[PDB]
Amino acid sequence: RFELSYVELDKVIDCLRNYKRKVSLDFIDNTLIAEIEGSTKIPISFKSNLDIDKIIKDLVHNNKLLSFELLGFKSVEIDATKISDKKILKEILRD
RNA sequence: GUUAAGUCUGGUUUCCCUCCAGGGUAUCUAAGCUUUGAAAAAAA
């Protein structure tokens, strides 16, 4: 099963508060980055249970169909303008 | 070639009781009282 042993946010949450931004992801470069349409791209450190074989990243980045159906599993439009604690933003970005 | 964007769909149908048993057994009256007391032979 998929186990996310840890993900080192608390830096993405910083640059998110009081704003309404779309948090895009990208997994090429072998390190998970978290693009923000509010013009910042924080590289995310994480440890998972699945080892993406470095062939799968390329198979998804090259196949224009895969990278197209990947738009739906890639982003959230987080709205922190109103009351927005850090913990629930953590769970949002974690999921 | 470059970018940028995902969009649609988020439980339906059927079945809602069927069969057997629908009373059986015991008791079905019992014990008393079964006539009594007045008038039986009357005046013309």
Longest dimension (CA), chain A: 42
Length A87 CA → B31 C1' (Å): 100
User: What are the angstrom distances between the C-alpha of A92 and each of A9, A13, A29, A76?
Assistant: 11, 10, 24, 9
- SS3 of chain A: helix, strand, coil, percent, to 5: 25, 30, 40
Q: Which single residue is written with the structure tokens 């704003």?
A: A19
- Tokens coding A82: 């109103």
How far is residue A75's CA from residue A72's CA, in Å, rounded to a whole number? 7
- Tokens coding A78: 């987080």
Nucleic strand B interface residues, CB < 7 Å: A 22, 37, 67-69, 71-72, 74-75
Backbone phi, then psi, for A71, in 5-degree steps? -60, -35
Backbone phi, then psi, for A92, in 5-degree steps? -60, -55
Q: Which chain B positions have some atom within 7 A of a protein CB?
A: 5-8
- Quick one: resolution in A? 2.4
Sequence-ordered alpha helix ranges (H) in chain A: 56-62, 66-69, 86-94
The structure was resolved experimentally with: cryo-EM
